[PDB]
């Protein structure tokens, strides 16, 4: 499946099984653009989080209950959701994927 393939290729399952990961099917520039969209509170108390005006194409990858390194196994869920990112730096760009809504 896509999750197993992309998780491996992107070095999230080569040296562990990362329990959860989200992939966004939008251009890098359109995701970066989120950092000047709607400012929202972060879960951690900071306020450098931003929510996309638009829903975006995303794939959620979540480890199965039986999955165990090295034989990582994922469930793949596809959705169109608003994304929430934490932004930082100069340029002010996404550094953490927080949630999808």
């Amino acid at each position: 499946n896509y999750c197993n393939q992309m998780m491996k290729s992107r070095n999230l399952t080569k040296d562990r099984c990362k329990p959860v990961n989200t992939f966004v099917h939008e251009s890098l520039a359109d995701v970066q653009a989120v950092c000047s969209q709607k400012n929202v509170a972060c879960k951690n108390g900071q306020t450098n989080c931003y929510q996309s005006y638009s829903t975006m194409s995303i794939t959620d990858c979540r480890e199965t209950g039986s999955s165990k390194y090295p034989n990582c196994a994922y469930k793949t869920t596809q959705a169109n959701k608003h994304i929430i990112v934490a932004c930082e730096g100069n340029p002010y760009v996404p550094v953490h994927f927080d949630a999808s809504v």
Partner: peptide, 15 residues
């Protein structure tokens, strides 16, 4: 050495 912005792109972007 990968930056935080680099790590986000690798982990999350699949344009």
């Amino acid at each position: 050495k990968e930056t935080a912005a680099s790590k986000f792109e690798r982990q999350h972007l699949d344009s």
